[PDB]
């Protein structure tokens, strides 16, 4: 590697919002992040967030069957 | 403003009551 043209990679500690820690190398000695891969709702298996719906619209528009049988 | 229904001023305008103008 050429001398004097690159930033020195150093051991680096990465901190996520889920209390996660990553031991990688970087140009910054310690970086904090709000999200990592250990907690991204896509990554964390199915993790269906606010929306378990699908949908239930619309044929689940019951309530009610109160027309006389 | 008076057009902002979600305010104690706009509710006075439409003459109505709600969380944003209770009685």
């Amino acid at each position: 590697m050429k001398e004097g043209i690159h930033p020195k990679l150093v051991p680096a500690r990465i901190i996520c919002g889920c209390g996660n820690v990553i031991e990688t190398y970087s140009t910054k000695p310690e970086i904090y992040v709000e999200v990592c891969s250990k907690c991204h709702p896509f990554y964390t298996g199915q993790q269906r967030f606010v929306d378990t719906e699908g949908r239930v619209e619309r044929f689940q528009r019951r309530y009610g069957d109160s027309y006389r049988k | 403003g008076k057009g902002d229904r979600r305010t104690r001023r706009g509710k006075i305008w439409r003459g109505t009551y709600g969380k944003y103008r209770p009685r």
Partner: protein, 83 residues
Amino acid sequence: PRSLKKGVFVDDHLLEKVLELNAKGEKRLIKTWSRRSTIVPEMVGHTIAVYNGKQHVPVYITENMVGHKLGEFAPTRTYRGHG
């Protein structure tokens, strides 16, 4: 929307028309003027002729258009833009 303290509105006369078809192995062409009658699960798969003020438009009813009124699918004004 209609106060759900009251029911979901179907003019009854239209509702008979569809429950007979289900019982007798549907379906006939159903021509009604009740543009207001709410699409109700007992209608999916049928086709209702909705009067828009001039004609009875056919309307094939699917599951994804249930919470609606029939008039929503037979528009009353023809446009085509201005010259």
